[PDB]
Amino acid sequence: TVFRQENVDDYYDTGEELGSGQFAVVKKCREKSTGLQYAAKFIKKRRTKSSRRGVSREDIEREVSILKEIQHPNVITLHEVYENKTDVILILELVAGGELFDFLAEKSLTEEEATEFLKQILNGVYYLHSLQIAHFDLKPENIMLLDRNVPKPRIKIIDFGLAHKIDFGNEFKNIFGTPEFVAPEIVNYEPLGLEADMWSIGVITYILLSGASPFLGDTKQETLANVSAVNYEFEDEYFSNTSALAKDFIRRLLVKDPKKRMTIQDSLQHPWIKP
Numbered sequence: 443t444v445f446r447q448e449n450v451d452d453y454y455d456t457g458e459e460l461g462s463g464q465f466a467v468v469k470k471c472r473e474k475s476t477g478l479q480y481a482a483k484f485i486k487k488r489r490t491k492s493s494r495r496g497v498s499r500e501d502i503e504r505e506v507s508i509l510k511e512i513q514h515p516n517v518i519t520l521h522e523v524y525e526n527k528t529d530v531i532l533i534l535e536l537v538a539g540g541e542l543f544d545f546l547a548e549k550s551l552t553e554e555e556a557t558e559f560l561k562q563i564l565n566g567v568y569y570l571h572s573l574q575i576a577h578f579d580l581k582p583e584n585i586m587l588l589d590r591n592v593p594k595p596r597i598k599i600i601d602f603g604l605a606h607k608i609d610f611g612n613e614f615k616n617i618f619g620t621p622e623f624v625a626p627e628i629v630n631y632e633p634l635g636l637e638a639d640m641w642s643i644g645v646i647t648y649i650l651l652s653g654a655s656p657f658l659g660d661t662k663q664e665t666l667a668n669v670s671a672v673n674y675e676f677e678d679e680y681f682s683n684t685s686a687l688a689k690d691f692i693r694r695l696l697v698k699d700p701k702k703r704m705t706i707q708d709s710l711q712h713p714w715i716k717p
């Protein structure tokens with residue numbers, strides 16, 4: 443699939459940089475014809491077949507095709523796609539309130555503050571999983587707020603760069619996600635499905651309530667070894683006033699066997715969440 447090949451700078455002006463990764467940079471932008479503001483994600487293309495730099499066209503097209511399907515209050519919306527010889531440029535909904543990660547560093551959350559965020563995450567993941575879309579990269583960095591100066595900020599899931607459609611209940615690919623948040627089946631190079639996202643939500647919930655990462659080691663290999671062995675515990679120093687039911691929710695997500703892990707529907711019916 444080909445994208446718009448006119449120069450993006452003829453239709454948008456860019457501003458503040460919003461974020462920067464190995465193969466992409468995101469810049470605030472403004473559409474000249476409407477004054478409306480967006481986030482432009484510039485993805486570096488691969489320059490040869492065998493190269494390891496840049497993102498393969500297959501991977502870029504997969505992300506675009508997923509973004510084109512989704513429309514939900516808790517997921518980013520895609521506006522337009524441009525390309526040139528160097529980059530594919532996704533014009534995405536602007537989410538300007540900052541990361542859940544950075545907002546976390548400002549303060550641990552109470553269970554009410556945590557569940558208010560978590561319920562929005564669960565609602566977005568429920569929508570995705572309903573469409574058989576696995577995100578495969580859920581982590582505080584990919585959860586951003588629309589406005590961080592309200593008592594109950596609204597969140598959006600960003601970054602569909604690892605997301606896959608799961609038409610057969612599992613996909614057999616490598617997911618090089620972030621060690622602290624990937625499920626044991628990713629660490630072990632196993633077939634992957636929607637369950638991997640539910641493990642990541644369990645990790646996110648642990649961090650939201652405690653300020654601490656449950657599997658984090660001193661090196662990436664230690665973190666990955668801890669994930670595979672399900673080597674975590676609730677430290678009393680961090681969890682002593684956290685309810686048992688919040689711990690129960692986490693414990694039913696941080697389950698090695700994906701078949702025994704809570705699904706997204708289970709998580710919404712769990713007594714800690716269900717109203």
Ligand SMILES: O=C(/C=C/c1ccc(O)c(Br)c1)c1ccc(O)cc1O
Nearest residue numbers: 460461462463466481534535536537
């Ligand atoms: O920084 C990133 C996310 C940014 C963002 C900020 C505000 C937004 O509205 C939107 Br959409 C995205 C990022 C994304 C992908 C990647 O491969 C590397 C990255 O660093």
